[model samples]
Target chain A: MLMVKVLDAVRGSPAINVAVHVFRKAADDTWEPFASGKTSESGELHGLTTEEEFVEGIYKVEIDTKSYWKALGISPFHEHAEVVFTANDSGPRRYTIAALLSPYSYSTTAVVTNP
Target chain B: MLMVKVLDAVRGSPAINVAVHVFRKAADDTWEPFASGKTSESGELHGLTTEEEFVEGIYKVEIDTKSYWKALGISPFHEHAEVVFTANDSGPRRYTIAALLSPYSYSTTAVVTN
Candidate 1:
């Protein structure tokens, strides 16, 4: 399964209600929409994709970084924070992408563990 | 000045002794070595560049991910973690980049407050 979490570095807390967009790189070299959601109060968005649907392909996870910061009355640097990678190519495992966000910058860490 | 910190998500501890390489993009589009250091016990590396030397230009910060994980007897996915940005383009502010690391993936966050 695929999961995502967002944390706020400036406030030292979870980033709640941040929009998450998941897309798969299609064979035609275009992005096909897969799933979309917002971070919960705990800063997590779960049930993004299942093992059956998440086949071997490149995926792009885009976070609405601008809207998130704008809601907090701050302007962010990036229009959006994007993480692109090839999934299930090496092996099947649970994918969890954790994003650390700040006004000026954000970072993403992928934690793929045995499911 | 620019500061960097690395955290290990799997271990939930500071990533110590990770090598950091700082480079500036020359006018000719080549990367020129600027500074180098390793993360301290607290996972922070400071004194990367000064206000005067950190003029308006693009800079790349690279962390040796492979070496850090290999030393711990684990194989990591990424060879390194790199962050490139235009410094002083939006005006000078102190740049602090925080990278979260795991064996499979890593994420970087920049907290630039000039």
Candidate 2:
């Protein structure tokens, strides 16, 4: 399973209402849209994909950073934040991608657990 | 000129006492030291650089993730977390470097302002 969380470093709170999009690489090298959602009040988006459908491949997560800061009447540095990774584990793998957002920058990190 | 902050995602608290090293690149592209310190109780390290010393150039901020996690009796994935960027007087002049730490990963981010 995959989950994402966004934290606002400036306000020291969870980044609410930020959009997150998930995509998988196809055979033709095009990104096939898998899931899309906004972070909850707790700054988390979960239940993106099931274990069966999340096969071995490269995946991309697009975080809409510009729209998020724009909503608060502030200009940000990056239009969007992208986290791309390869998933090739044969067994169960639970992944959580966390993005710490600042107006001028962001940090993307992951916690992977094999159950 | 520059400040640093660290957060421990696992404990949901400030990462205190983690060492932060500041290095600047020279003409040959090798990093040289500028400042070294540890975060306080607030997960913050301030007064690392002066405007005069922090001239235009490339800089790297190295956070010692291993020691912090090790001190807590947790084995961390990466030995350290590094954040590198170019600083210029022409653009945003001040920077706030932040690192979010989990046992399995870390997120290094920054805030720049004019």
Candidate 3:
């Protein structure tokens, strides 16, 4: 299983209604869409992949910063951001991608936890 | 005059206690310290530059992300963020730098209002 959460770095607030995309890296390093959705009021997007859909390979996540920032009347430094990581079958069955965002920079981390 | 306000992009929450730095760009492109402070409970840092401290030239503001994120048990991508802009004397006397931050990205806008 794969889950994603976004938060405000400074205020520690949840980011709601932000768009998140998940893609699997093909043999040619091309991104193939796997799942996409918007965050809930809790700033979380979970159950993105089922047991069958989850695979061991490279994956990427893209966040839509343009639309979100524009709605708040903020001019962001980047239109969007992309994060890539490796998914392993032997590791924990659950994986989480957590992101901390600010107007000038952003950071992400991938962790494995038991389901 | 220069002021800063930080907000959460998604929830529109104010960011309190975030460290902010102000530097004036010199003729040689060097950064000279002008002011440094942390955001108040209202997520605002104002009166950064007084009438005499305000100069017409290039300036930069940097935000410390490492400590802020570390406190929340969040691993951020960058340790800090820097923003550069020009400060004019003839334009609006009040300049605001508003930042919208998320875990994966951040955006800054410099505007002159009144």
How do the residues B1-114 of candidate 3 rate in per-residue lDDT, one tens digit apiece? 789998654345688899999998888888988899999988899978787868788888999866776776766667787899888777688888988765546778888877
- Candidate 1: which stretches are off by over 4 Å? B1-114
Top candidate by DockQ: 1
In model 2, the runs with Cα more than 4 Å from the true position are A1-115
**Could you give candidate 3's per-residue lDDT for residues A1-115 as a string of tens digits?**
8888987654457878899999998899788999999988889998788887787888888988667767867676777878888887576468888877666567788888777
- Model 2 C-alpha lDDT per residue in residues B1-114, reported as the tens digit of each score: 899999999889999999999998889977899899999999999999888888987777878888998999996655476666667677778888887887766666667877
Q: Give the C-alpha lDDT of model 3.
A: 0.80
- Candidate 1 local distance difference test against the native: 0.84
DockQ of each: 0.20, 0.15, 0.08
Which one is best on TM-score? 1
Span of ten consecutive residues with least summed lDDT in model 2 chain B: B76-85
Task: Give the better candidate number (1 or 3) by TM-score.
Answer: 1
Model 3 stretches astray by more than 4 angstroms: A1-115, B10-12
List clash counts for every candidate, in order: 3, 0, 15
Instruction: Put down candidate 2 lDDT per residue, A1-115, tens digits, no spaces.
Output: 8999999998999999999999988999888998999999999998898888888887888899889999999876555777666664456688888988887777777788886
**Arranged by lDDT, best first:** 1, 2, 3
Q: What tier of docking accuracy does candidate 1 attain?
A: incorrect
